[PDB]
Write an enzyme that holds these catalytic residues in place. Structure first.
Site, PDB file in Angstrom:
ATOM      1  N   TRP A   1      32.975  42.157  29.683  1.00 15.88           N
ATOM      2  CA  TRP A   1      34.363  41.847  29.981  1.00 15.88           C
ATOM      3  C   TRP A   1      35.125  41.915  28.657  1.00 15.88           C
ATOM      4  O   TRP A   1      34.695  41.301  27.692  1.00 15.88           O
ATOM      5  CB  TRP A   1      34.395  40.430  30.523  1.00 15.88           C
ATOM      6  CG  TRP A   1      35.707  39.913  30.989  1.00 15.88           C
ATOM      7  CD1 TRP A   1      36.606  40.536  31.824  1.00 15.88           C
ATOM      8  CD2 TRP A   1      36.242  38.612  30.727  1.00 15.88           C
ATOM      9  NE1 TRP A   1      37.680  39.703  32.066  1.00 15.88           N
ATOM     10  CE2 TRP A   1      37.480  38.519  31.409  1.00 15.88           C
ATOM     11  CE3 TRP A   1      35.801  37.513  29.978  1.00 15.88           C
ATOM     12  CZ2 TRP A   1      38.278  37.365  31.361  1.00 15.88           C
ATOM     13  CZ3 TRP A   1      36.609  36.375  29.922  1.00 15.88           C
ATOM     14  CH2 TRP A   1      37.828  36.317  30.610  1.00 15.88           C
TER      15      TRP A   1
ATOM     16  N   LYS B   1      36.160  33.223  41.437  1.00 16.88           N
ATOM     17  CA  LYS B   1      35.886  34.191  42.500  1.00 16.88           C
ATOM     18  C   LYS B   1      35.247  33.457  43.660  1.00 16.88           C
ATOM     19  O   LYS B   1      35.507  33.683  44.833  1.00 16.88           O
ATOM     20  CB  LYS B   1      34.954  35.248  41.916  1.00 16.88           C
ATOM     21  CG  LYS B   1      35.847  36.417  41.500  1.00 16.88           C
ATOM     22  CD  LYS B   1      36.462  36.246  40.115  1.00 16.88           C
ATOM     23  CE  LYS B   1      37.089  37.559  39.624  1.00 16.88           C
ATOM     24  NZ  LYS B   1      37.944  37.294  38.471  1.00 16.88           N
TER      25      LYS B   1
ATOM     26  N   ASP C   1      27.362  32.955  30.543  1.00 16.83           N
ATOM     27  CA  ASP C   1      28.652  33.065  31.202  1.00 16.83           C
ATOM     28  C   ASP C   1      28.331  33.316  32.677  1.00 16.83           C
ATOM     29  O   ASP C   1      27.783  34.362  33.028  1.00 16.83           O
ATOM     30  CB  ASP C   1      29.447  34.216  30.583  1.00 16.83           C
ATOM     31  CG  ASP C   1      30.818  34.391  31.221  1.00 16.83           C
ATOM     32  OD1 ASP C   1      31.003  33.891  32.340  1.00 16.83           O
ATOM     33  OD2 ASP C   1      31.703  35.016  30.604  1.00 16.83           O
TER      34      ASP C   1
HETATM   35  C1  LIG Z   1      32.134  37.702  32.807  1.00 16.69           C
HETATM   36  C2  LIG Z   1      33.381  36.883  33.020  1.00 16.69           C
HETATM   37  N1  LIG Z   1      33.557  35.726  32.290  1.00 16.69           N
HETATM   38  C3  LIG Z   1      34.620  34.896  32.502  1.00 16.69           C
HETATM   39  C4  LIG Z   1      35.668  35.318  33.310  1.00 16.69           C
HETATM   40  C5  LIG Z   1      36.958  34.509  33.312  1.00 16.69           C
HETATM   41  O1  LIG Z   1      36.977  33.694  34.476  1.00 16.69           O
HETATM   42  P1  LIG Z   1      38.313  32.875  34.817  1.00 16.69           P
HETATM   43  O2  LIG Z   1      39.277  33.799  35.520  1.00 16.69           O
HETATM   44  O3  LIG Z   1      37.896  31.721  35.693  1.00 16.69           O
HETATM   45  O4  LIG Z   1      38.926  32.368  33.525  1.00 16.69           O
HETATM   46  C6  LIG Z   1      35.509  36.475  34.085  1.00 16.69           C
HETATM   47  C7  LIG Z   1      36.531  36.839  35.135  1.00 16.69           C
HETATM   48  N2  LIG Z   1      36.215  36.131  36.384  1.00 16.69           N
HETATM   49  C8  LIG Z   1      34.376  37.282  33.916  1.00 16.69           C
HETATM   50  O5  LIG Z   1      34.232  38.432  34.640  1.00 16.69           O
HETATM   51  C1  LIG Z   2      38.217  38.316  37.596  1.00 20.27           C
HETATM   52  C2  LIG Z   2      39.426  38.419  36.929  1.00 20.27           C
HETATM   53  O1  LIG Z   2      39.377  39.609  36.065  1.00 20.27           O
HETATM   54  C3  LIG Z   2      38.148  40.157  36.246  1.00 20.27           C
HETATM   55  C4  LIG Z   2      37.997  41.378  35.374  1.00 20.27           C
HETATM   56  O2  LIG Z   2      36.955  42.069  35.355  1.00 20.27           O
HETATM   57  O3  LIG Z   2      38.960  41.666  34.610  1.00 20.27           O
HETATM   58  C5  LIG Z   2      37.408  39.399  37.174  1.00 20.27           C
END
Ligand SMILES: Cc1ncc(COP(=O)(O)O)c(CN)c1O
Ligand SMILES: *c1coc(C(=O)O)c1
Ligand SMILES: Cc1ncc(COP(=O)(O)O)c(CN)c1O
Ligand SMILES: *c1coc(C(=O)O)c1
Lengths: 396, 396
Positions: free
Chosen positions: A130, A246, A211
Site C-alpha cells: 500500500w 473494510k 498490518d
Molecule cells: C494494507 C493496509 N493497511 C492499512 C490501511 C488503512 O486502513 P484505514 O482506512 O482503516 O486507515 C489499508 C486500507 N484499508 C490497507 O490496505
Molecule cells: C481501503 C482504502 O484504500 C485502499 C487502497 O488500496 O488504497 C483500501
C-alpha cells in the site's frame, strides 16, 4: 511563510476518481476503487452496524471523552480476534490495545511510539505494498526499505527473493507483514511460509509489525489470523495495526487498533504508557462512534452472528467474482492463464496488465484500474463482467 | 526492544479522577474535571445532537471514506463561525479547512504541516496554557517557548509582560493565541488589546496560530471571534485550530478543524495540498459521525436554533456559578476579593489557592482541583456551593 511551498504530488486516487466521474461513456467501469462494493455497485452500511447505531442512539447518555486507549471492550474483542480466545498472550496480560482512528492511525501511532521510545530507525515493507505505508513511517522520521515479494512471471510469492532481501535487515529493524489479503497482490504466505518467517524473525532480531486491514476477507476470521498467531507463538514482542474499515464497512468512522505485545505484563504496561503519550500528543483520544459500534457487535451474540454472516457474504462475493473473471476471460478468448486470480485473497490483485494497457483500457474502453494494473475484484459484477473482459481481451 | 523503555510521566488527570473515585467521603466535589457539567452533575448529549444523530441513522446509506479534508459543509460552516458570513477571507477564497479528530488533531496537523513545509522551528505559548500544547508541538519536532500572561497579584492579563516577553520572538516564529476563554485562566484580551497584538504580530513577522476550543463560552459566538477577526483583517497568513468538543458536547466523537489562511486562493490551495499530505500520513481521513452531526446542525435553521440555545444555556450556567461562587465565599467569611472570578470567561479560572491549599482541600475536605489551583466552575452547583465554599474558607 507559505508563498514558496511546493504542492504535494498529485493525488492518484481522486483524479482517477475524478476522471471516472467526468467520463461521459455508458458502460464505464471503475476497478480502481478502494472499498468493497456489492452486486449492485453500492457500499451500504451493514445491517449489524445500523442495528448497533440504533442501540447507541437509544442508550448513550454522554459523549464524555474515552480514555486515551479508547473503549475497554473494544480492546478485549480486538485481542480475541487477533490472538484467539484463551491465547497465552491474553492470559499472561502481555498485550495492550489502543483504539485508533483507523488502520492508518494505528500505523502512525506505532511509528511515533517506535521513533520516540526505541532505537528503531528503519521499517521493511514489501515491494509492492500500500503506497501510504512509506508516507506514514517517513512522517514519524523512520526510513523505509523494501523487500522482494512479487514474482511477476508466475504471479506468486517469490519466497526465495523475500528471504534473500530480508537478509539485509539488521537486528532491531522493523519488518512489516500484511496479516492476510496482501495489498495490492492478494498473495499471502502459506502457514508453513509464515512459520518459516516467524523462526527467521526470531533468529535475526526483527520486530514484527503486522498490518491487519482485511481480517475475514481471505478464508475466515480464525484462518486469516494463523500467520499472526504463528509469529505470536515465537516472539516476546510485536505490534499489530488492525483496521475495521473494510470488514465492518466502517471506513469513514475511523475504527482501528494498535496492539502492543511485550514479554510480560510489567514490560507491556510500561511501554504502553509511552504509546498513550504518543496518542495524547496526536489526537488526544479516539473517536467513539465507530469503535462503539464494533464493541457493541462483537460483544453481543445476536449482532455478532449477523455481522459474521455479512462478512462471509462479502468474502464469498469476492471469491465468486474472481472465479467469474477467470471464466469470462477464457470465454471471451483471452487464451492466456489467469488462474492465479482464483488463488489470490481479498479485493485486490495485479491483473498482469502493463501501465500502457491500463492507460489504453481507460482511454478506449472506459475501464479504470490503478496504473500498476491493480484491480479491485469487488468492482466487478455479473452484469459488468462481459464488457469488462471484452475490453481486457482487446488490449492483450 | 521494549525492555528498557521509561514509563511516561504519571497522568495527572486520571489519578486525580482515580483519587476522586476512591474517596469514600460523602460531600466530595470534583472541580478538576475537563468537561462541562449541568446543574445535576451530568454531561448529557445535547438535544440538537440527538436529533441530528437520529437524522443520520435514518438517512445515511454508506460509510464510504470522506475526503482527506472531510465534509465540505462542515468546512464551510466552520469558516463562517470563525470569520463571519460575508468575510473577505471567505469571498476571496483565502481559507481552506480540514475537518480533524478534535482540537488536538487540528493542532497536531498544524504542527506537522509547519514542521515539514516551512522554516518554523519554534512556537510561543502563554504561561500558563493547556499542558498538552507543549506535547503536541514537541511531537512534531517544534520547540516551545513561553510568553508571560498571568498577573498572579491582580488576577488579570499582564499585558506589558506579555509584549515584553514576545519581543524575544523572531520573525517566522509561531505565536499561539487562545481565541477566547483562555485555558486555564479565563483571562482574555479586550478587543483593543487584540488589535494591539494584531498590529504587533504584523510588524514582527509572527505567524499567528489561534486555538479556538471554546467559541460561545465567553460572551457569544460572534463576540468570541472578535480577536481572531481583528488578526484576520491584518494578516495575509494564519492558522486556526478549532474544537467542537465543549460547544457541541461532542468530546468523544473528535470533532475539530484546522483552517489554513494565505494571501490568495492559489497560495492557500498549494499550501493546503501539503496539509492534506500531513493528514494522509497520520490518520488518512477524519471520523464522520461527530462532524456530520455538526454540519447537520449548523446548516439547518431549526437544529441550529436549538443548538445555539443549548450553548447559551451552558454559557449562562457557567456565569451564574461564577457569580454564586463569589457571593457564597463572601457570605461564608472569606473576607478577601474574589471579584476577578466574575470577569473571567469560560469554565476555568485560577482560584488563587496555592498548591498546598489545593492538596489540603483534597485531603481534609474531599474538594478536588488541579495542583495549579485551576477550578472548573461547571463542577459547581447551587447544591454543592455552600460546602465547597466552607471548605475553601477553611484553608485560607
Ligand atoms: C494494507 C493496509 N493497511 C492499512 C490501511 C488503512 O486502513 P484505514 O482506512 O482503516 O486507515 C489499508 C486500507 N484499508 C490497507 O490496505
Ligand atoms: C481501503 C482504502 O484504500 C485502499 C487502497 O488500496 O488504497 C483500501
Ligand atoms: C486550549 C485548548 N486547546 C485544545 C483542546 C483540545 O480539544 P479537543 O478535546 O477537541 O481535542 C482543549 C481542550 N478542549 C483546550 O482547552
Ligand atoms: C477539555 C478537555 O480537557 C480540558 C482541560 O483543560 O484539560 C478541556
Amino acid at each position: 511563510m507559505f508563498e514558496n511551498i511546493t504542492a504535494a504530488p498529485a493525488d492518484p486516487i481522486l483524479g482517477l476518481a475524478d476522471l471516472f466521474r467526468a467520463d461521459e461513456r455508458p458502460g464505464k467501469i471503475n476497478l480502481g476503487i478502494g472499498v468493497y462494493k456489492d452486486e449492485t455497485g453500492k457500499t451500504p452500511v451493514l445491517t449489524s452496524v445500523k442495528k448497533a447505531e440504533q442501540y447507541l442512539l437509544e442508550n448513550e447518555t454522554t459523549k464524555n471523552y474515552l480514555g486515551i486507549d479508547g473503549i475497554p471492550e473494544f480492546g478485549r474483542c480486538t485481542q480475541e480476534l487477533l490472538f484467539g480466545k484463551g491465547s497465552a498472550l491474553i492470559n499472561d496480560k502481555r498485550a495492550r490495545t489502543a483504539q485508533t482512528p483507523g488502520g492508518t492511525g494505528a500505523l502512525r501511532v506505532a511509528a511515533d511510539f517506535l521513533a520516540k521510545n526505541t532505537s528503531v530507525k528503519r521499517v521493511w515493507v514489501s515491494n509492492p505494498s500500500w503506497p501510504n505505508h512509506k508516507s506514514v513511517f517517513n512522517s514519524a522520521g523512520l526510513e523505509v526499505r523494501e523487500y522482494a515479494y512479487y514474482d511477476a512471471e508466475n504471479h506468486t510469492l517469490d519466497f526465495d527473493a523475500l528471504i534473500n532481501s530480508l537478509n539485509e535487515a539488521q537486528a532491531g529493524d522493523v519488518v512489516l507483514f500484511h496479516g492476510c489479503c496482501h495489498n495490492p497482490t492478494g498473495i499471502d504466505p502459506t502457514l508453513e511460509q509464515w512459520q518459516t518467517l516467524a523462526q527467521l524473525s526470531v533468529e535475526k532480531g526483527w520486530l514484527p509489525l503486522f498490518d491487519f486491514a482485511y481480517q475475514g476477507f481471505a478464508r475466515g476470521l480464525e484462518e486469516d489470523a494463523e500467520g499472526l498467531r504463528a509469529f505470536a507463538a515465537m516472539h516476546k514482542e510485536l505490534i499489530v495495526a488492525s483496521s475495521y474499515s473494510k470488514n465492518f464497512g466502517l471506513y469513514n468512522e475511523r475504527v482501528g487498533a494498535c496492539t502492543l505485545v511485550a514479554a510480560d505484563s510489567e514490560t507491556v504496561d510500561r511501554a504502553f504508557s509511552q504509546m498513550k503519550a504518543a496518542i495524547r500528543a496526536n489526537y488526544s483520544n479516539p473517536p467513539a462512534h465507530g469503535a462503539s459500534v464494533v464493541a457493541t457487535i462483537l460483544s453481543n451474540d445476536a449482532l455478532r452472528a449477523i455481522w459474521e454472516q455479512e462478512l462471509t457474504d462479502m468474502r464469498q462475493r469476492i471469491q465468486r467474482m474472481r472465479q467469474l473473471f477467470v471464466n469470462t476471460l477464457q470465454e471471451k478468448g483471452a487464451n492466456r492463464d489467469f488462474s492465479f486470480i482464483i488463488k489470490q485473497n481479498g479485493m485486490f490483485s495485479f491483473s498482469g496488465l502493463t501501465k500502457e494497457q491500463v492507460l489504453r483500457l481507460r482511454e478506449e474502453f472506459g475501464v479504470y484500474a490503478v496504473a500498476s494494473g491493480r484491480v479491485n475484484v469487488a468492482g466487478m459484477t455479473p452484469d459488468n463482467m462481459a464488457p469488462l473482459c471484452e475490453a481486457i481481451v482487446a488490449v492483450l
